[PDB]
């Protein structure tokens, strides 16, 4: 059969180029412009402003995170009204 | 020597398996090994913190809680100083 990726993975893939905030399972949240995405949610960011829950604010460039350690991701509001969300009734 | 051939040769022989939780060890005659590395052993004795907790008998252990496995022939269960 034909493999169907998830709608949330499609929304992650369509979020490339816009600034998103990814919080890992380690309590560190980095907000920056996503530069790539993969089907396994392994995303690479360029701006990456990182804030760690112990209170550590820093900046880093070209940071890649695997999908396993990634807990939550927040994307821009415009993608809330994306073409993917329309229920195709053929 | 592949790990599957090593487990096949370790069958019907005394082996000691150290688990990943609590640093426990189980020494006994390995009876059956599955494709998913599921272990079934006979005459098993459990030891905790280098102290023998006691013999249990026929023990079935899944591969998830198993950390390391070795032959029990010529191996000392006491920790070297």
């Amino acid at each position: 059969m034909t493999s169907s990726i998830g709608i949330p993975i499609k929304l992650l893939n369509e979020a490339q180029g816009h600034i998103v905030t990814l919080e890992l399972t380690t309590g560190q949240t980095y907000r920056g412009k996503l530069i790539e995405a993969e089907d396994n949610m392994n995303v690479q960011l360029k701006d990456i402003t990182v804030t760690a829950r112990d209170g550590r604010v820093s900046h880093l460039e070209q940071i890649y995170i695997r999908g396993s350690h990634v807990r939550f991701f927040i994307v821009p509001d415009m993608l809330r009204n994306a073409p993917m969300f329309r229920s195709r009734n053929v | 020597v592949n790990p599957r051939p090593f487990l096949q040769d370790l069958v019907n022989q005394d082996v000691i398996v150290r688990l990943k939780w609590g640093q426990t060890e189980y020494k006994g005659r390995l009876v059956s090994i599955d494709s998913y590395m599921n272990i079934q052993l006979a005459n098993t004795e459990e030891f905790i913190n280098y102290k023998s907790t006691g013999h249990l008998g026929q023990v079935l252990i899944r591969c998830n809680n198993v950390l390391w496995v070795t032959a029990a022939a010529g191996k000392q269960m006491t920790p070297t100083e």
Binding site: - | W21, D34, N38, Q40, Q58, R62
Partner: protein
């Protein structure tokens, strides 16, 4: 049919009580009724034992072995740490 599944099937057919040590710090003495390939088990006449440390007025006392009786129990194979057929 020839590995630990054979031992589980033999224990289920013999209806013999076996002790399963669960990774949440629990023990379960129960008779095997049904088993799956992913180590998921359904058992009858289960006695579940655990050790609870009573903290009275901020002082940690001696642990107590608490026990409970369950008529029918269903345990997932993921939470199973060790099994011993008795």
């Amino acid at each position: 049919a020839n590995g630990p599944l054979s031992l589980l099937q033999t224990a289920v057919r013999s209806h013999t009580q076996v002790l399963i040590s669960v990774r949440s710090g629990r023990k379960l003495l129960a008779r095997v009724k049904a088993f799956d390939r992913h180590c998921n088990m359904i058992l009858e006449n289960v006695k579940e034992m655990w050790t609870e440390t009573p903290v009275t007025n901020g002082k940690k006392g001696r642990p107590v072995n608490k026990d409970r009786f369950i008529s029918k129990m269903f345990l997932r194979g993921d939470s199973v740490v060790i099994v011993l057929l008795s």
